[PDB]
């Protein structure tokens, strides 16, 4: 798998109606992206765009603040567990 | 050391080449027969070491590319001295065996490995950093000048 990290600090911008809600294998809510979604980060200097390829998880929310180098998306034996 | 040479102690060399030292003593009339030639070797008569150098020259030995052939030279001390790119020692006796050791097993006609044809004795470790530092050129750009700029000439 591949992790997409934020190249700058700023505010995430995308249309949440273009993606499908899902629950990740870590128990977190997220979005499933089946298209070439355009995600915008508005940084302190300029506005930057990151292309989200289909079949990828979008881990952030619209209008969320992200830090640089923070994971924002993920491009995508039988064991027994005792509690 | 050269790539084709190795260093042998006196204590090891004299045992490996004892038969040749005895013959050298008899040939040059320094010992009357076999029995006398042994006593001079036993008693460390200094003429023994002169003969040992003579008979060792031009006589390769096998050291165990795990086994190779080197030209031995007498060295001071008690340890075997090997070049940095390289215990059983074999002395070929017959001329057929000595020809094979010098002409087939020496460390300069086997510079390529048979697997894919790569070189065997590429410099490594301290040899490699020395070349890297030597050929790491001048600092450039912002690492060479504090400010934006908006040297000697040698004839040979």
């Amino acid at each position: 798998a591949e992790h997409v990290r934020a190249p700058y600090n700023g505010k995430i911008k995308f249309n949440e109606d273009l993606v499908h809600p899902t629950r990740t294998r870590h128990g977190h809510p997220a979005f499933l992206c089946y298209i070439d979604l355009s995600v915008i980060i508005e940084s302190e200097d300029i506005i930057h765009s990151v292309t989200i390829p289909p079949k990828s998880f979008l881990l952030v929310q619209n209008d969320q603040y992200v830090e640089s180098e923070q994971v924002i998306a993920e491009i995508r034996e039988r064991v027994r567990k005792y509690i | 050391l050269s790539l084709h040479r190795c260093g042998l102690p006196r204590e090891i060399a004299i045992e490996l080449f004892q038969t040749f030292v005895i013959r050298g003593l008899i040939r040059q009339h320094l010992a009357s027969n076999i029995g006398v030639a042994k006593s001079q070797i036993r008693e460390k008569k200094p003429i023994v070491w002169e003969i040992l150098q003579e008979v060792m020259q031009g006589h390769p030995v096998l050291l165990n590319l795990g086994i190779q052939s080197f030209q031995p030279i007498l060295v001071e001390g008690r340890t075997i001295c090997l070049h940095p790119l390289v215990m059983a020692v074999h002395v070929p006796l017959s001329l057929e065996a000595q020809a094979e050791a010098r002409l087939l097993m020496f460390s300069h006609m086997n510079l390529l490995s048979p697997a894919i044809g790569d070189p065997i004795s590429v410099p490594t470790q301290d040899m490699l950093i020395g070349l890297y530092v030597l050929t790491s050129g001048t600092r450039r750009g912002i690492c060479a000048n504090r400010y934006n700029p908006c040297e000697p000439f040698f004839c040979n």
Partner: protein, 592 residues
């Protein structure tokens, strides 16, 4: 063992007491003291034994846990056997008590049965007497490949054999103890609720009880706007690792040396070394040759004093009083109208042809308590294990003479007698002769020949961090690189050996060793100092380096641009080397 490190021979000592006190009767269903002394049983090649009334002889054990059979020192090692099959709660330990009791039962179904046991049983081994460390660790071995969670605090995860027996011969942990069912037990500090007496909070846990307690190894130096009880620490529970609040913790592991064996516990800054090099370091310290002159390490862990006490190599008073007379051969001590004469070992050969020799550590008129040191043995100074020397060292390549593990040294280590050792060889001629194997005849009974061996090309040296080297070149002092104070270095090590082997602890030790020598200080530092704060070792080393630089007016000792490193000069040319070089005074041992 509840508030101190237990005696390293306590397992052997208590097991033999159980055999005499209870084991004899269980098999018989009076003991007479030996007529000879232990030193007599060695000189005459006899057996130190007691008479059972006349059924026969029963070999007796020394306080050091060793037997004397036909003049040979022997140690019975511990075996681990099946009582998850690899869980220690399904295992059991058979000690000298179990083995000697089986022989007595075999004997009653008395002399030749014990002589044959010590000579032929694979668990009876000739005691390794190379140095004080080898004597003390031999009796703590466990003979049976993977580390199990139940081993923590009982069996060392590092100290094992190299070869094909790896994982089948291990070492007991420093605080380990054998329980009432052949089980290994380790002490933990109990966190008790408000309403309970709880006289002693230190309790020993068998492996069966271990899984069902929450055991934390962290500390309580963390506070936020909440309360301390809600802070989280890593803990062990049900053979896994969790992260839980302090209020859910049942037990704390508090002893610094709890999880490792003696050999691993002698490595300063061990937490900065890869665990593979700590295993190789334990083996090398068991190969260290006692030197003719001994010297304490500048930097140690603090366990060196425990090894000296438990090895039996030094002489310790059995009675309090005052010292009246000392010489090379004896010390006379008198207390409460009782006078004692204590002979001193002089130039005695050991199992591995090493030289044993005792030197008095007290003068006339000095008051002594019972159990205090009287004389220093070989490889022991002032009641501390001393396996090596502190020498000036630089890490840099030098013309290929330190290629790979090769080591370049100065001639001053040769004519200074820094690494000269005595070796006594016994061959089965007038006394004091010089025979030619060259050496001097020292004792004729058997001929004993003494050799004085200085350091040579081809000899092997090692630090305590798995850094092992072979001497390849000896240079005159004017050819060696020298510091900004003009002093040439004694050894030059290859710096390329550190990143590949990942043993950074030698870098910490050498810098701190230099500071200690200039400050006239020694350091005894328990491992894992990072539990106090981040970069604890770096703060300790850099602060001591700066203090040494400031107090002695030696600015090269602490360079703010590159702490721990300094520009040095080529002895051949006088030009400085281009890049700064790390220099220091580490503890280097000479190997057999």
């Amino acid at each position: 063992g509840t508030s101190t490190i237990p005696g390293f021979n306590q397992i052997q000592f208590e097991g033999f007491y159980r055999f005499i006190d209870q084991g004899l009767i269980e098999e018989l269903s009076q003991l007479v003291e030996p007529l000879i002394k232990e030193r007599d049983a060695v000189y005459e090649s006899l057996t130190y034994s007691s008479e059972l009334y006349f059924i026969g002889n029963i070999p007796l054990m020394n306080s050091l846990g060793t037997f004397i059979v036909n003049g040979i020192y022997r140690v019975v090692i511990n075996q681990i056997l099946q009582s998850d099959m690899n869980h220690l709660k399904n295992k059991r330990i058979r000690s000298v008590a179990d083995l000697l009791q089986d022989q007595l039962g075999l004997a009653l179904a008395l002399t030749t049965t014990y002589e044959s046991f010590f000579g032929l049983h694979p668990l009876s081994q000739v005691l390794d007497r190379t140095n004080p460390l080898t004597q003390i660790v031999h009796g703590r071995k466990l003979s049976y490949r993977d580390i199990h969670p139940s081993h923590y605090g009982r069996i060392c995860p590092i100290d094992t054999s190299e070869g094909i027996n790896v994982g089948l011969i291990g070492s007991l942990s420093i605080h380990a103890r054998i329980g009432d069912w052949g089980s290994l037990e380790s002490p933990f500090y109990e966190l008790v609720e408000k309403s309970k007496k709880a006289q002693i909070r230190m309790l020993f846990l068998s492996p069966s009880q271990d899984e069902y307690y929450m055991i934390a190894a962290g500390n309580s130096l963390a506070l936020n706007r909440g309360i301390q009880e809600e802070q989280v620490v890593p803990a062990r529970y049900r053979q896994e690792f969790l992260t839980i609040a302090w209020e859910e913790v049942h037990l704390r592991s508090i002893f610094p040396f709890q999880y490792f064996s003696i050999g691993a516990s002698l490595i300063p800054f061990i937490e900065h070394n890869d665990a593979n090099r700590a295993l190789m370091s334990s083996n090398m310290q068991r190969q260290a040759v006692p030197l003719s002159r001994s010297e304490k390490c500048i930097v140690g862990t603090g366990l060196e004093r425990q090894v000296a006490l438990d090895s039996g190599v030094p002489a310790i008073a059995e009675h309090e009083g005052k010292i009246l007379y000392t010489d090379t051969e004896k010390i006379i001590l008198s207390g409460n109208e009782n006078t004692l004469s204590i002979p001193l070992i002089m130039y005695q050969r050991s199992n591995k042809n090493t030289c044993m020799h005792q030197k008095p550590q007290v003068r006339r008129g000095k008051c002594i308590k019972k159990g205090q040191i009287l004389a220093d043995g070989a490889a022991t100074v002032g009641g501390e294990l001393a396996l090596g020397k502190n020498v000036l060292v630089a890490y840099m390549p030098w013309e290929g003479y330190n290629f790979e593990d090769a080591v370049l040294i100065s001639e001053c280590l040769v004519y200074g007698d820094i690494y000269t050792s005595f070796h006594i060889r016994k061959y089965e001629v007038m006394l004091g002769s010089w025979v030619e194997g060259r050496g001097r005849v020292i004792d004729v009974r058997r001929v004993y020949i003494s050799q004085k061996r200085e350091i040579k090309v081809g000899d092997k040296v090692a630090g305590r961090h798995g850094n092992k080297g072979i001497i390849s070149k000896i240079l005159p002092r004017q050819d060696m690189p020298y510091l900004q104070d003009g002093r040439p270095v004694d050894m030059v090590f290859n710096p390329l050996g550190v990143p590949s082997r990942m043993n950074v602890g030698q870098i910490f030790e050498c810098s701190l060793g230099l500071a200690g020598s200039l400050l006239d200080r020694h350091y005894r530092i328990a491992p894992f100092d990072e539990r106090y704060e981040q970069e604890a070792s770096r703060k300790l080393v850099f602060s001591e380096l700066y203090e040494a630089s400031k107090q002695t007016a030696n600015p090269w000792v602490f360079e703010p641009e590159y702490p721990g490193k300094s520009r040095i000069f080529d002895g051949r040319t006088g030009d400085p080397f281009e890049q700064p070089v790390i220099i220091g005074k580490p503890y280097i041992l000479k190997l057999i």
